[PDB]
Structures are given as structure tokens and as C-alpha cells.
């Protein structure tokens, strides 16, 4: 396993890089087919403009463009393409949304087009499985007017986690095979220090991804003539949608699989727990959980309870006092022991030195006599209970030479042997 070397000490391990979009159902808001309408294909092999129309029903396998054509095997020789219907201009937008199921670390997200690329599109991500949405990337010639975002604003340490708007990739000059590629770490200061940047580790994290196609393109104001041939040429179409990344596991899992609830979850290692290995698995609360870096694996270490406790919990005070080494307090120390690690016998018990501290009967009872001894706590080495005056014996259960037990419970033995 790549989560440990050959010795094998734990080492940071991440799942494989994948096309998180591939093969998954993508909910849309527009699809040609119902009812069967006409769509035109504008091209130019030579000069000026051409036009070649066709029909698009959904009930026929040949001339249909379902939402499954975004995330299927895309052979460049025969483009399995999706398209909408039809003139959804402004403020009509058509959206594309897919649910990954688990938090992914998104590297890129790309869209190849059949139709000319839109004048304005927006990419939205989610980090809570769809209930809320935040902007990831904007594309528009007029960012300030369209998305209220500054045109190609700089990215420094502060606005690093803020989506940006660029006017690139917007032009319709590549009317076919247009590409829209979004790099999540593109031009962000802390990119070269990603393993130590929580702001960027959070930025690349996404549960669901939404693509919002806003404004469309036109040929120099030649679309306002609402023709049954003209407007039937302006539409959105993508051949393949990809989302590059990997399961978020904080470098504590080499792979993610689906459990009994059919939900994709990281196969956590390094004594970690939770959906993204974001926790310490039980009884491993000795030092705080933290994400694994390339340098240190930061595996959760088990609480030291000397085989006298099953449950423990972390304490920051004890941790600092221990010079940041062990802050895991043992709970409900059985086997008659005491201490934050169950490393010694409680009051009223002395340590049997014949057994190691981890042994079940490592602690033995004092059995200090109720009336003979002065207290319950005895010596930890020998076991000699605190004997009152005139009382002797390991457990203080007999009188010393020349004494004799009395009828007084707080004055035992004290009666000196008088000469009849």
C-alpha cells in the first residue's frame, strides 16, 4: 500500500486522478427533442456565412442530444454532442449541474463545444452537497456589467479564495470545437505551497458543480431579425464535460469506495475517520488530527492507557504540558488504576511489582483493617498500611508485642498487657 513505505512508517497517500464527470447523470434545464424543433449549423469553409439545418426529436436515437452526451466516451472522430433548444438568450440562462456525491479536490473543469462558445458563462461549485452554491469562475467580455466582477482582477493572498472573471475563451471565432478550460490553481500565490495552504485546499474542494450559460453570440447584430431560420442557429452545445480531480481524503487514504449505504467514502488509513479522513478514529486522540503533507504523514496515534481503558479523549492543556507529545486522557480507568494514562494504582491499592503495569492484576488491594489501620492508602512498594499506635501487621490486623485489642473502635490494641 502507498500509505506506508517498506519499513513501513506511514506516508501521505492520495487516491488516483480521475474524470469525476465521466459516466454520471447530469441534470440540465434545456434539451432538444420535446417538441422536435429545427436547429441550424452555421459554418464557413471559404468566406462569409453558410447554413445547414436539421431536425432534433428525442424519440429517435439518431437525431437526439440527451444530457448523457456530456459525460460519455468522447471519441474526437465522432463527437457525441449535447445541445439545447433554442434561443435562450437573456436573462434566460441554461444550467448544467452534476452531483459528485463526495468532496473532491477539483484540479480543472473543461468543456468542449459543438456550437460556438457563449459570450458569458459561469461556473458554480458547492461544498455542502447542493444546498448552497458559490462562484468558481466567470467568463464574459463585460464582467463588471454581467456578473458584477472586476475584469480580470488580480489575485493576491487576500482575494485568493475569490472567483475571478476573464474575457478569454469567450470569442466565437472557433465556432466549432471551442474549448473552455478552468484551472483552479491558475495564478494563485499559494499554489506552489499547496500542502501548507488551507485557503487553497478549501478552494479546490467541491461537492457539486454547476455550469451556467448566460448570454449567447451573434454575427455583428444579425439576429434581432426573428427569422425561423436565423434564431434556429443560435444555441448552446457541448461535446464533452470533464471535472479533473481526486477524492478529498487529506492524504490519509489511497482510494475511495462505496460502503453499505452506497455512498462514496474514502477508505481511511493512518488511524483516521470520517468521510474525508477528517477525524481520528476512536482511542487515537493522543495528538490533534491534521492533514497529511508530503513531509509528514501526521497519522493519528493511539491513546496510551496501559491496557486499562477503551475510551479516551484529547486534552489541550495536558498536551502542552507534555511538550506537545501526548494529550490523550484515558476515561474510566478500570483494573483499579489511576492517572491520565492508567500508569499507577489508585488510592487503597498497591502495585504488585511481579506484574508489568499493563497486566490485568497489576494492582493489588491494600485491605487495610477498618479498625487497625489509620487509613486506606498504603505503601506502593511494600503495601504496609498506616498502622495506628499499638497496631502491627501488613494490613494492621493484629496487636504489637505487649498489647491487647480493646472494645474501643478508635482505640484498638492500645490496652497494654498489664500483669494480671
Amino acid at each position: 500500500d502507498p500509505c506506508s513505505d517498506e519499513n513501513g512508517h506511514p506516508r501521505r497517500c492520495i487516491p488516483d486522478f480521475v474524470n469525476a464527470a465521466f459516466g454520471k447523470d447530469v441534470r440540465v434545464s434545456s434539451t432538444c427533442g420535446r417538441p422536435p424543433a429545427r436547429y441550424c449549423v452555421v459554418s464557413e469553409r471559404g468566406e462569409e456565412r453558410l447554413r445547414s439545418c436539421h431536425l432534433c426529436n428525442a424519440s429517435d436515437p439518431k437525431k437526439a442530444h440527451p444530457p448523457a452526451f456530456l459525460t460519455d466516451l468522447n471519441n474526437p472522430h465522432n463527437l457525441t454532442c449535447w445541445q439545447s433548444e433554442n434561443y435562450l438568450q437573456f436573462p434566460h440562462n441554461v444550467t448544467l449541474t452534476l452531483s459528485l456525491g463526495k468532496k473532491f479536490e477539483v484540479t480543472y473543469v473543461s468543456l468542449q463545444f459543438c456550437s460556438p462558445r457563449p459570450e458569458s458563462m459561469a461556473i458554480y461549485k458547492s461544498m455542502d452537497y447542493g444546498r448552497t452554491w458559490v462562484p468558481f469562475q466567470f467568463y464574459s467580455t463585460q464582467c463588471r456589467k454581467m456578473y458584477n466582477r472586476p475584469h480580470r482582477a488580480p489575485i493576491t493572498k487576500q482575494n485568493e479564495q475569490e472567483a475571478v472573471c476573464t474575457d478569454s475563451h469567450t470569442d466565437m471565432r472557433p465556432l466549432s470545437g471551442g474549448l473552455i478550460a478552468f484551472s483552479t490553481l491558475d495564478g494563485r500565490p499559494s499554489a506552489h505551497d499547496f500542502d501548507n495552504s488551507p485557503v487553497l485546499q478549501d478552494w479546490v474542494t467541491a461537492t457539486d458543480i454547476r455550469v451556467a450559460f448566460s448570454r449567447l453570440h451573434t454575427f455583428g447584430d444579425e439576429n434581432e431579425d426573428d427569422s425561423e431560420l436565423a434564431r434556429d442557429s443560435y444555441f448552446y452545445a457541448v461535446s464533452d464535460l470533464q471535472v479533473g480531480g481526486r477524492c478529498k481524503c487529506n492524504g490519509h487514504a489511497a482510494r475511495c469506495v462505496r460502503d453499505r449505504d452506497d455512498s462514496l467514502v474514502c477508505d481511511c488509513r493512518h488511524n483516521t475517520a470520517g468521510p474525508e479522513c477528517d477525524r481520528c478514529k476512536p482511542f487515537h486522540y493522543d495528538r490533534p488530527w491534521q492533514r497529511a503533507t508530503a513531509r509528514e504523514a501526521n497519522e493519528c496515534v493511539a491513546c496510551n492507557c496501559n491496557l486499562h481503558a477503551r475510551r479516551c479523549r484529547f486534552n489541550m492543556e495536558l498536551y502542552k504540558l507534555s511538550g506537545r507529545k501526548s494529550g490523550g486522557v484515558c476515561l474510566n480507568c478500570r483494573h483499579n488504576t489511576a492517572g491520565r494514562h492508567c500508569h499507577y494504582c489508585k488510592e487503597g491499592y498497591y502495585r504488585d511489582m511481579g506484574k508489568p503495569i499493563t497486566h490485568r492484576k497489576a494492582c493489588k488491594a491494600c485491605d487495610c483493617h477498618p479498625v487497625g489501620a489509620a487509613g486506606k492508602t498504603c505503601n506502593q512498594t511494600t503495601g504496609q498500611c498506616p498502622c495506628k499506635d499499638g497496631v502491627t501487621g501488613i494490613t494492621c490486623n493484629r496487636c504489637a508485642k505487649g498489647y491487647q485489642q480493646s472494645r474501643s473502635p478508635i482505640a484498638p490494641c492500645i490496652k497494654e498487657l498489664h500483669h494480671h
Partner: protein
């Protein structure tokens, strides 16, 4: 002062519970010596003693750890904006996940069948540290302790039954008996051996 509301309690592991809440008392922030400090109380749900076990946090979620497996817990929350606290929130409940047992069944007894020889009626009692719902009772018995632990006679008892009949046991023979408990999340440890010797033939008369 209005106590926090929308308290949730989510079981994470067989020892961990995530509590989450919300505070509608949101002013112009963030400052400074009066940051809203929450306190997460918890105890064993509907019990006999349970002196609670609080902990402070400034976030809107705390995770209780070191809880007992297969156990329901009460969770309430308060908010303190110095020097003004609030009453406790409405209690949320959660039951930690199960875990493989950490003890063996007790009161393992072997009684001779009446009045049939060769047969016994084993009886026992569920383990204290079950850590879940017992689904099966694996029983072992044999006529020689020198052999390994696994190669005895393994019999799987229903799990909801505490009595099992073993038959065709040789007369005038010493038998051994071991039993462990099983649940959803694994199987517990075996008990200590309990010797039982069948009767002789000339003793059944009469």
C-alpha cells in the same frame, strides 16, 4: 438572552458525536472581548446518575469524543456573551454506533438433560460489554484441552437465545465449554473454559 437553537446530534463513530447549532443573535461583528462563547453539555440519555460533561467552543459545532459504543446521549447548548449567559438550549439526542463486544458471556452453566443422558442444556447470560445487539452466540466444546482453540466443535446459536442443547455426548467423559458473543460489528472474546463431566452408565440406575 436567547439560547442557541437548531441543535443537531449526529452519530459519527462508536465514540464520537457531532453537535451543531445556530445563533440568531447576530450583531455587527467581529469584536472583541465579548465574542459569543458556546458551551456543549452532554450526558447519558435517560439514565440514573449522569453528572453531565461540558466543554467550551467558539464555533457552531462541537464533537463529543470517548463516548460509550451503542449509547444514547443528551446534548444541550448555552451561549455566553460576557458577562451575560443564556439558559440551556433544547436537548438533541444521538446514539453512538455499535462495536464488537469486549467481553464474554457470563453465567455459563452446563446442566444434564432429564432424564436423557448423552445430552446437556447449556445456559448463559449476555455479556456486560456487548457494545451492540447480539446477533449470534458461538459455542465451543470438546473432550481434550490440549488441542488448539479453533478445532473444537463450533455451533452457532441464534443470538436471541440463551439456551442450547448439545447431544450425543459420551458417558463418563470430561467435556470442556467455551462461548463468545457476536454482533453487527464483529465478535467478542471467548470465556474461560468450564469443565463438565458426564455421568457413568451405572449411576443412571436409579
Amino acid at each position: 438572552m436567547l439560547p442557541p437553537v437548531g441543535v443537531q446530534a449526529v452519530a459519527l463513530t462508536h465514540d464520537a458525536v457531532r453537535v451543531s447549532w445556530a445563533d440568531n443573535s447576530v450583531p455587527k461583528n467581529q469584536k472583541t472581548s465579548e465574542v459569543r462563547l458556546y458551551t456543549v453539555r452532554w450526558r447519558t440519555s435517560f439514565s440514573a446518575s449522569a453528572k453531565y460533561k461540558s466543554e467550551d467552543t467558539t464555533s457552531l459545532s462541537y464533537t463529543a469524543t470517548g463516548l460509550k459504543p451503542n449509547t444514547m446521549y443528551e446534548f444541550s447548548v448555552m451561549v455566553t456573551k460576557n458577562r451575560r449567559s443564556s439558559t440551556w438550549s433544547m436537548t438533541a439526542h444521538a446514539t453512538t454506533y455499535e462495536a464488537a463486544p469486549t467481553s464474554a458471556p457470563k453465567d455459563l452453566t452446563v446442566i444434564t438433560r432429564e432424564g436423557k443422558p448423552r445430552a446437556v442444556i447449556v445456559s448463559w447470560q449476555p455479556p456486560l460489554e456487548a457494545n451492540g445487539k447480539i446477533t449470534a452466540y458461538i459455542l465451543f466444546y470438546t473432550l481434550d484441552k490440549n488441542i488448539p482453540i479453533d478445532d473444537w466443535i463450533m455451533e452457532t446459536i441464534s443470538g436471541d437465545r440463551l439456551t442450547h442443547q448439545i447431544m450425543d455426548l459420551n458417558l463418563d467423559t470430561m467435556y470442556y465449554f467455551r462461548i463468545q458473543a457476536r454482533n453487527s460489528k464483529g465478535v467478542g472474546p471467548l470465556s474461560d473454559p468450564i469443565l463438565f463431566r458426564t455421568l457413568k452408565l451405572e449411576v443412571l440406575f436409579a
